[model samples]
Target: KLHKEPATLIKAIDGDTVKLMYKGQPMTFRLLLVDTPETKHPKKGVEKYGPEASAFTKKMVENAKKIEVEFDKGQRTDKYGRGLAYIYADGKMVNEALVRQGLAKVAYVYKGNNTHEQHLRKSEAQAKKEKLNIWS
Candidate 1:
């Protein structure tokens, strides 16, 4: 079986984490392997292209009629306790889309416990090669 099932989207915290409601409660997910710029920073106060990244994430996450998530029991949470997941939104892995579109970078290195790192790396390479805004 694929490692995930559908969940309802509640809101987007930022480019990498989405707040979702499931089991009659609020839960949040930090996307695995792809990291976009931060829109709201504590000290830095919104990095460059942060708004674009945030807006793209909101569009990707909100417009989906169905969002599916995959997580391995081995590596489920980051240090921050947010649910770590690989999201499939609108039938595509939105994580890779973020990188391929030059909006995010391949991030959060894990040693094979989680899937999709290589793919994300490829996307990042492509983004860099193409000299997209993601590289900028």
Candidate 2:
């Protein structure tokens, strides 16, 4: 079973990154198993379809009835110390939701990946079939 625990939404930094308030402290978490387009690139300004993805994520998280985080064991946090986690809102996984909505693509879902890799891939396929967002 996947590891998960309730969290309070602080804000969404971008499509794949989120900030949460846990134990009354702030923490950053990157969405597991998926990568949305870049909204804030130092040299690129922003990439194509980036804003849409960012908007989607922000809306999803901000409007969620309840939110949670599922942590990863390895390659967990990036060099900057941002933990990799799967975000759940209401009853849906935002990581998988992004892929299913064509706002993100499966990436870095590693060898001992913590999330549902196969299910995410399937969502990506369905997104392509429907020509949603980025898929279009």
Candidate 3:
């Protein structure tokens, strides 16, 4: 069965990477279908709001007692073997939340998981209108 429970927030690795302790195991999850600015990539310097994005994400999940994770179809692991999942907290989908907050850009790597495409685009549009991060 898919383990769905509140995982303690260990730390935020970057804008897109977060480490959580689940079932007594340290699991690293890379937010799928979204790519934020490179915060840790040595060659690629941090983009606008990279730090802010990370901070925002951390704050969103910090000390949360419950979190939900939904697995995708097909591939279970990425190239690095990190489990890819659509994370949700309290009823809020993290993937959509990030995009809605202008912290991440929609990246439909897998054609099947584009269920939130319209929502992402709308969120990005709203973000642009508000000049959240893409302004400067």
Candidate 4:
């Protein structure tokens, strides 16, 4: 039942969060296991590389022919009521792409919820080694 379900992007809140239409309902989704710079945070305002992350995320979903979200084993949503899932844009995991680009880091991962932890870690390492964006 955790298979990817088709969704339509309503808006990108940040690099790691978005609003989407799924099954005819609008929902807020927080990308699982990844954290990006903050652009709209009230206290933080805008952080370094925040715009780049947001832009990249926007482009990915906006240009995609299809978008989908796959939920984790535990915790369907975060404390904020945002759905927690791995977002896919045209079949590629956006979480891993953000890490690979050094625009994000794997964070807030719970044991059972981290389906892509190993793969994401590998991408982060590569980004660190290559000194991309945040790693630079």
Candidate 5:
């Protein structure tokens, strides 16, 4: 059942990761298919819109009573043991929302899923063209 479920956004780890309360359990989600500038990445040293991305995410889902998670067919957990998830709220995928807003870039860690990859690519292109949060 890939549907929106009510969850409260508890914390923002970065532009792409978040901690949420779902069913009385605290869970961390690594947003699938998109990667934001590393606030902590040694090489990148915080990419563009890093703070804005975090703030926007906080504004969008911080107090949300409920949120949605759509799981990938084959992938369940990342190497770090965090659940890889596609977050959704208000009829929008949170991961894609970041990209569509130009707060993140497309990152397809999995190579075989063309559909999901394409979706990320399209979203990134749109974000770039629209310049959602890149500068402002």
Candidate 6:
């Protein structure tokens, strides 16, 4: 089972990156198990569909009545000290939503931290079959 906690969105930095008020502090989360196209990197020009992915996430998170974060059994934060968790917006898992919409790809699967990998991959497969956005 996962622990779900209420969070307030401080900012939606990118498709897979957000800052939220979790545990009474503003913490940045590099949304787990999925990687969206590059949008915020200064070294790299914005990839195709990257802006669309960022817009999609921004709209969803901003419009959501409730925002939450669900932690996996493994580690609370990554090596960069960013929170590693699934983002939820109004009961929808934003991580899987991005994969399902082809705005993100299921990536960075390490050991003991993939409670939702199978589900995310299924969503990715569906997006691939349909050839949406990034998958196109």
Tell me the tens digit of each residue's lDDT in model 4 across 13-121. Answer: 8898999998899999999989999898798899999999999999999999999999989888878889999999999999999999999988867647977888999
User: How much is the lDDT of residue 38 in candidate 4?
Assistant: 87
Ranking by TM-score: 6, 4, 2, 1, 3, 5
Query: Residues 1-136, candidate 1, lDDT per residue (tens digit)?
Result: 3467778899988888898775566778888888788988797888776888788878988999888888754567768778787888888888888889898888866544456788888888999999889675
Clashing pairs in 1: none
Candidate 3 per-residue lDDT over residues 44-88, each given as its tens digit = 677777888787777677745567666665465678866677777
Per-residue lDDT of candidate 6, residues 56-119 (tens digit): 8999899999999998988878888899999999999999999999999999675468999999
Q: Work out candidate 4's RMSD over C-alphas.
A: 1.3
Per-residue error (Å), model 1, residue 66: 0.6
- Angstrom error at residue 60, model 6: 1.0
Stretch of 10 with least lDDT, candidate 4: 108-117
Instruction: Kindly indicate the candidate among 2 and 6 with the higher TM-score.
Output: 6
The list of candidate 4 runs beyond 4 A from truth reads: none
lDDT tens digits by residue: candidate 5, 20-100: 776788888888787777667788787767787887677767655557766675566778766677777675777877888
Which consecutive 10 residues in model 1 have the weakest lDDT in total?
A: 107-116
Return the number of clashes found in candidate 4. Answer: 0
Question: What TM-score would each prediction reach against the true structure?
Answer: 0.89, 0.91, 0.81, 0.95, 0.80, 0.95
What's the candidate order when arranged by decreasing lDDT?
4, 6, 2, 1, 5, 3
Considering TM-score, which of the candidate structures 2 and 5 is the better prediction for this target? 2
Cα lDDT of candidate 3 equals: 0.72
Q: How close is candidate 2 to the true structure, as a TM-score?
A: 0.91
Name the regions of candidate 2 deviating beyond 4 angstroms. none
Model 1 misplaced regions, further than 4 Å? none
Candidates' C-alpha lDDT = 0.80, 0.86, 0.72, 0.92, 0.73, 0.91
Give the per-residue lDDT of model 2 (tens digit) for 1-136. 6678889999899999999986577999888889899988896889888998999999999999999888766576777778777889987999998999999999966546655888899999999999998889
